[PDB]
């Protein structure tokens, strides 16, 4: 962090990439979370199958 | 006060090792403008007290 930070800040770059990964994980959780996910939340009356 | 030889001063440093009564003597030219010896440091450190 001290030595290799011009023209780019190393800590900020690492934080940005990690936050991107975290946001992708959040998108995954919104769908596949076992207790609050959409797929778990749908009801049997609202579930249908292809013909 | 420093002794000089041919107008060139002699500078003491205890870091130069002296083994079995043998030692070494260095002669140096300094500065970028004259293609000499330079030291390198990193400015703008976080929590900096003195340069570098």
Q: Give the gap in angstroms from C-alpha B22 to the nearest C-alpha of chain A.
A: 39
Plot region of A15 (φ>0 → left; ψ -120 to 50 → alpha; else → beta): alpha
Plot region of A38 (φ>0 → left; ψ -120 to 50 → alpha; else → beta): alpha
Resolution in A for the shown PDB structure?
1.8
Mutate to test the interface with A, among B40, B41, B42 (most CBs of A within 10 A): B42
At A18, which helix (H) or strand (E)?
helix A10-32
Pairwise CA distance, residues A21 & A4, whole Å = 23
Mutate to test the interface with A, among B41, B43, B46 (most CBs of A within 10 A): B46
Technique used:
cryo-EM
Instruction: Answer whether A30's CB lies under 8 Å from A37's CB.
Output: yes
A-chain residue closest to B47, CA distance:
A2
Pairwise CA distance, residues B37 & B52, whole Å = 18
Q: Which residues contact B16 (CB under 8 A, 6 or more apart)?
A: B23, B24, B26
A-chain residue closest to B45, CA distance:
A2
At A38, which helix (H) or strand (E)?
helix A38-41
């Amino acid at each position: 962090a001290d030595l290799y930070s011009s023209p780019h800040d190393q800590i900020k770059e690492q934080l940005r990439l990690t936050i991107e990964t975290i946001k992708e994980r959040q998108e995954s959780e919104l769908i596949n979370n076992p207790e609050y996910g959409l797929l778990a939340s749908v009801t049997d009356d609202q579930r249908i199958s292809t013909l | 006060q420093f002794i000089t030889w041919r107008g060139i001063p002699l500078i003491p440093s205890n870091k130069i090792p002296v083994e079995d009564g043998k030692t070494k003597i260095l002669l140096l030219r300094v500065g970028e403008k004259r293609q000499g010896i330079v030291g390198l440091f990193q400015p703008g450190l976080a929590g900096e007290q003195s340069p570098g």
